[PDB]
Write a protein that binds this ligand. Structure first.
Ligand code: FAD
Ligand code: FAD
Ligand code: QSC
Ligand code: QSC
Lengths: 339, 341
C-alpha cells in the first residue's frame, strides 16, 4: 500500500503522521511518502499568527465544530509534556474585543475560562465596549512543522521536494492512495471554484513584554480585518488584513499601514518594537473544508484520492480533527481492499 | 525643605518622586536629593521577580491592603499608555497552585478576573489539587528603577553615591527632612530587631515561550519556599527559597538545585531553557512595614525623619501606596510649620 501525501503544511504533515501512527503497526507493507514543492519555512502554515481560535460564527458543517474541539483537546493534552514548547505549543491568555455586544461564540466551552470582560478590563482598551477573555494555546506553525517532520522522518516517512502536475502522474508512478493537502493551490490539480485565496499580511515584531493575545473585531469588515496582536514563542505577530480573492503574494503599503497604525493604536508600547519581518500568505478560503474520498481511474486500476483542503484562517485550529477523519477514511479504503 | 532620601531601590526612588510631584509647585526652595550606596542594577529591587501579588495571608497592619490596592490601581492606570513597558510594566496572567483547598485571598478583587482553577486547568499541573487564575501586572524592578531615575533626573532631583553612617551626619549637613528608605539595612542607622533578612535566591533563564506566572505554595514551609516561575520582560525568574534570618549574600548549590529541580518538575519545558544568571537578595522582612515619622534632635534644631522600610517580599506590589503615605506625612510636617498646600 503506497500512500503519497501531497503537501507539507500543517494539513499534510499532520495527516501523514496520523495515518502512519494509526496503521504502521497493523498494515504490512505500508509506505507513506510526502511530496510537496515547498517545505517549512516556505509554506502558508509558516506565516500563520499561531493561535487556536475558530471563527466567531459557527461553521456550516457541524463536523467542523467537532474537529476544532478534537484539535483543542489534542493540543491541550500535551501541555505538561517536556516537549510542548519544542512542538511550538504554549498556553496563552487573551482578549477578544468588540464595539458592541455580540453573542458568545460556539467554542466558548472548548477554551479554558471563557468569560465576558468587566468594565475595569475594558478601560485597557478605550476604543472598544464589549469583549471576552479566555485561555487558549499558541501553536507556532514553523516550529510545529519542524516537529512534525522530525517525527515523520524518525518513523521512516520519506520526503520529496517535487511539484505535482496531476493526480494522474502520482497514481501512474505507484501511489495506491493520494492524500490531497495542497491548501490554496488545490485548484491547479482539480478545478474548485469555491476555493479562494484569503490574503493575509502580517508584521512580525520583537516585543517580548507582550504576554497576552488581543484580537479586535470589526463587524462591518469581516473576520481579521481589524487589528490583532498574537504573542509567539520568540516574536509577536501583528495583523489586521484578510482579503478574499486577492492573489498578490507581494506585501503592499496600505496593508502595512493598516496593520501598523491599527496595532500601534491598540498597543502603543509597540513604538519601541523592532520589526523582524513582514509577510503575506494565502489562507485556503472555502465555504467548508473539503475532506472527502474520490475515485480516480487511470491505467489498470483505481487510485483513491482523499481531499483535505480549504481550512481558511483556521488550519492550525482545526488540523487534528481533520487528520483523524482522513485516517478513518483511509481505513475504509483498506477494508474495501481486503487489507 | 531640604529633603534627603536615603535609598535608591523601589521604595526610595518612588517616594522621592511622589514628594517631588506633590510639593514642587507649593514650596519654593524644594531641594530633594537621593543618597545611596547601591544603585540599579545592584539593589534588592533589581533581583525581584517582578510580580504584583501580596502574601496570601492578611497583613498585621490592614493599611497595607489599601497600599497594595492603591499601587495596583496606579499601575493599571498606565496600561494603554505608550510608556508602560518602558516603566517595566506589562499585564501578565497566571496560576496559583495549592495541594489542598484554601480560602480566597484578601486581594482577589484587586487583581483582574480572579477565579478558581477548573479540573482541566489543574490537569496542566498534576502535583496540585486546587488553585487560582488571575491577571495581574509585571513591574520589573531593574526597568522601573531606570525609569524612576530618568524621571527624577528630569525634575532636577540629584543623586549622590554615599554610605550614610548616621542620621546625625545627614542632619548636620543641613537636611530638614530625612526619608529613610534603606531596606533590610535600616538597622544600621537605628536598631530595629523586628527587621530581618529574607534571603531569596533565583535562577534567571531564557525561556521566552513561557507567557504565564506559575506560583506553587506549601502551606507548611512559609511563603515562597515552593517553586515559582515568573516571566519577565526579557527573561524568566525561577524561584523557590525565601529564608528569614539568613544573611549569606552568595549563591549556594543546594538552593540552586532546589529551585532548578522544583521548577523543572513544575514546568518541564525548562529542560531547554538557557541559564542567564543566578542571584541572591534580601527581602526586608518585618511583621509590618515601618512607615512613620520620628523627630530627632542634634544640637538646637529638630530633624524630621520619615521611615519607609520593611516591605518583605512585596515591595514592588505595595510601593506606590507607601510613597503616597510618606507624601501625606510630609504634608503634615509642612502644615506643622505654618506652610500651606
Ligand atoms: C496571515 C495568516 C495568519 C494565520 N493565522 C492563523 C492562526 O493564528 N490560527 C490558525 O488556526 N490558522 C491561521 N491561518 C490559516 C492557516 O495558515 C492555514 O489554514 C493553514 O496554514 C493551511 O494549511 P495547508 O497545509 O492547507 O496549506 P499550506 O501550509 O499552504 O501547505 C500547502 C502545501 O501544499 C504544497 N503544494 C501545493 N500544491 C502542490 C503541487 N501541485 N505539488 C506539490 N506540492 C504542492 C505546498 O508546497 C505546501 O507544502 C492564518 C493564515 C494566514 C494567511
Ligand atoms: C528573590 C526575591 C524576589 C522578589 N520578588 C518580588 C516580586 O515579584 N514582587 C514584589 O512585590 N516584591 C518582590 N520582592 C521583594 C522586593 O524585592 C523588596 O520588598 C523591595 O525591593 C525592597 O525595596 P527597598 O527599596 O526597600 O530596598 P532595596 O532595593 O534593597 O534598596 C535599599 C536602598 O537603600 C540603600 N542603603 C541602605 N543602607 C544605606 C546606607 N546606610 N547609606 C546609603 N544607602 C543605603 C541601598 O544602597 C539601596 O539603594 C522580592 C525579593 C526577593 C529577595
Ligand atoms: C488570527 C488568525 N486566525 C488569522 C490572522 C490573520 C489572517 C488569518 C487568520
Ligand atoms: C514572587 C515574589 N513576590 C517573591 C519571590 C521570592 C521571594 C520573595 C518574593
Amino acid at each position: 500500500m503506497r500512500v503519497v501525501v501531497i503537501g507539507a503544511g500543517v494539513i499534510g504533515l499532520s495527516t501523514a503522521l496520523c495515518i502512519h501512527e494509526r496503521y504502521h503497526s497493523v498494515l504490512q507493507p505500508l509506505d507513506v511518502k510526502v511530496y510537496a514543492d515547498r517545505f517549512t519555512p516556505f509554506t502558508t502554515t509558516d506565516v500563520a499568527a499561531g493561535l487556536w481560535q475558530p471563527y466567531t460564527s459557527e461553521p456550516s458543517n457541524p463536523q467542523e465544530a467537532n474537529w476544532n474541539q478534537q484539535t483543542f483537546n489534542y493540543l491541550l493534552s500535551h501541555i505538561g509534556s517536556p516537549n510542548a514548547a519544542n512542538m511550538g505549543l504554549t498556553p496563552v491568555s487573551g482578549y477578544n474585543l468588540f464595539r458592541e455586544a455580540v453573542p458568545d461564540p460556539y467554542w466558548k466551552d472548548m477554551v479554558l475560562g471563557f468569560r465576558k470582560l468587566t468594565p475595569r478590563e475594558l478601560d485597557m482598551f478605550p476604543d472598544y465596549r464589549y469583549g471576552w477573555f479566555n485561555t487558549s494555546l499558541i501553536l507556532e506553525g514553523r516550529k510545529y512543522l519542524q516537529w512534525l517532520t522530525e517525527r515523520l522522518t524518525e518513523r521512516g516517512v520519506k520526503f520529496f521536494l517535487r511539484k505535482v502536475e496531476s493526480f494522474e502522474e502520482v497514481a501512474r508512478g505507484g501511489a495506491d492512495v493520494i492524500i490531497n493537502c495542497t491548501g490554496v493551490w488545490a485548484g491547479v490539480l482539480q478545478p474548485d471554484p469555491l476555493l479562494q485565496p484569503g490574503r493575509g499580511q502580517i508584521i512580525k515584531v520583537d516585543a517580548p513584554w507582550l504576554k497576552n493575545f488581543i484580537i479586535t473585531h470589526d463587524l462591518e469588515r469581516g473576520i481579521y480585518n481589524s487589528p490583532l496582536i498574537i504573542p509567539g514563542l520568540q516574536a509577536v505577530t501583528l495583523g489586521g488584513t484578510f482579503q478574499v480573492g486577492n492573489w498578490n503574494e507581494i506585501n503592499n503599503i496600505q496593508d502595512h499601514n493598516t496593520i501598523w497604525e491599527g496595532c500601534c493604536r491598540l498597543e502603543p508600547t509597540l513604538k519601541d518594537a523592532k520589526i523582524v519581518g513582514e509577510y503575506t500568505g494565502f489562507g485556503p478560503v472555502r465555504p467548508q473544508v473539503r475532506l472527502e474520498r474520490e475515485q480516480l481511474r487511470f491505467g489498470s486500476s483505481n487510485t483513491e484520492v482523499i481531499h483535505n483542503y480549504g481550512h481558511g484562517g483556521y488550519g492550525l485550529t482545526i488540523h487534528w480533527g481533520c487528520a483523524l477523519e482522513v485516517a478513518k477514511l483511509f481505513g475504509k479504503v483498506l477494508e474495501e481492499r481486503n487489507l
